[PDB]
Amino acid sequence: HCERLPYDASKWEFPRDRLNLGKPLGRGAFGQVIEADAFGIDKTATCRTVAVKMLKEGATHSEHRALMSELKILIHIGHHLNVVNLLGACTKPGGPLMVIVEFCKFGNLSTYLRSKRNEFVPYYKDFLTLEHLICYSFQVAKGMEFLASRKCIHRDLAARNILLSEKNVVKICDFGLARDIYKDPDYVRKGDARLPLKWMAPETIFDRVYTIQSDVWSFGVLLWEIFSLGASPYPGVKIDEEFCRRLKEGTRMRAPDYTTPEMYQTMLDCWHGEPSQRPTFSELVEHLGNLLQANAQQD
């Protein structure tokens, strides 16, 4: 829902005097995220690194409302291992509105996988393997199955919106910063931005239609990103009216360099032209769970 939903301060409110703000993690035109140290945020006697979303200086009513809405949305969604974890909030008088979520130390999965291209083998202590890639895929499907059950649609499911925490746990998020149409051109490097059109289901381009089944299409692109180790989709292709036409017609990406046949089949399944014929997230959880277990079995 929205900023007007009730807010259970007993459950969520965290003292500002137990938050020590550190360095920025991300900044856009409408909000910023800062790394922070929070003491006792999960009831134990520990100092935990967290990420704090808050407003920038000079924020309007509209911006405040937007951040309050996000907070209520996150409370509504609830907790899942593979979704951005809301830990607390600072909303009462005497300081800025702050939304506190778990920090995922390895950052976004696209950049991470790119950094591991020379540290990948199919089947080496710090290497990635097929086991890793299929596990990340499975985890995202689990998170999306959960989001679907909360009646949420992601709308921009991509590897850049997946964060990697310790112990190879990935979490789905939606930064909502718009960093790459905000970033100073002096400091923009190749790789910083991505083109969201490349993740959109045909019906999302042509009918502006967002559904859970359009997220399944996007998940197929995310799979392609995983098994290309963080490459950009549709390499070399110009994303114009022509590309869109070809897409509605049946043209698809070729297999990425690190895929197994079964994973490329799944991509193709996710890219069905008919939304109702794409797998559901529940179906993807079962199938990828099977692929994961088969991957690690004995002879």
Ligand X SMILES: COC(=O)Nc1nc2cc(Oc3ccc(NC(=O)Nc4cc(C(F)(F)F)ccc4F)cc3)ccc2[nH]1
Chain contacts with ligand X (rule: CB under 6 A): 25-26, 33, 51, 53, 70, 73-74, 77, 83-84, 101, 103-105, 107, 147, 152, 154, 163, 172-176
CB of 169 to ligand X, least distance (A): 12
| Cα–Cα nearest to 227, from 269, 191, 260 | 260
Establish whether 40 is an annotated binding residue: no
CB of 14 to ligand X, least distance (A): 15
CB of 129 to ligand X, least distance (A): 22
CA atoms within 13 A on the CB side of 212: 18
Q: Specify the residue, 152 or 193, whose C-beta has the smaller distance to ligand X.
A: 152
Q: Specify the residue, 53 or 194, whose C-beta has the smaller distance to ligand X.
A: 53
In sequence order, what are the beta bridge partners of 100? 52, 88
CB of 111 to ligand X, least distance (A): 8
* Residue 36 · residue 18 · CB < 8 Å: no
Establish whether 36 is an annotated binding residue: no
Establish whether 297 is an annotated binding residue: no
CB of 140 to ligand X, least distance (A): 11
Q: Specify the residue, 111 or 260, whose C-beta has the smaller distance to ligand X.
A: 111
Establish whether 33 is an annotated binding residue: yes
Q: Specify the residue, 154 or 278, whose C-beta has the smaller distance to ligand X.
A: 154
Structure tokens belonging to residue 286: 């079962």
At 112, the amino acid letter reads: Y
Q: How far is CA 193 from CA 5, 14, 164, 219, 240, in A?
A: 34, 34, 19, 19, 18
State the Rg of the chain over Cα: 20
Q: Specify the residue, 121 or 188, whose C-beta has the smaller distance to ligand X.
A: 188
Establish whether 92 is an annotated binding residue: no
In sequence order, what are the beta bridge partners of 51? 35, 101
Active site (catalytic) residues: 156
Establish whether 11 is an annotated binding residue: no
| Cα–Cα nearest to 281, from 131, 110, 133, 150 | 150
* Residue 152 · residue 144 · CB < 8 Å: no
End-to-end CA distance of the chain: 50
Binding residues, as ranges, are 25-33, 53
Binding residues for ATP, as ranges, are 25-33, 53
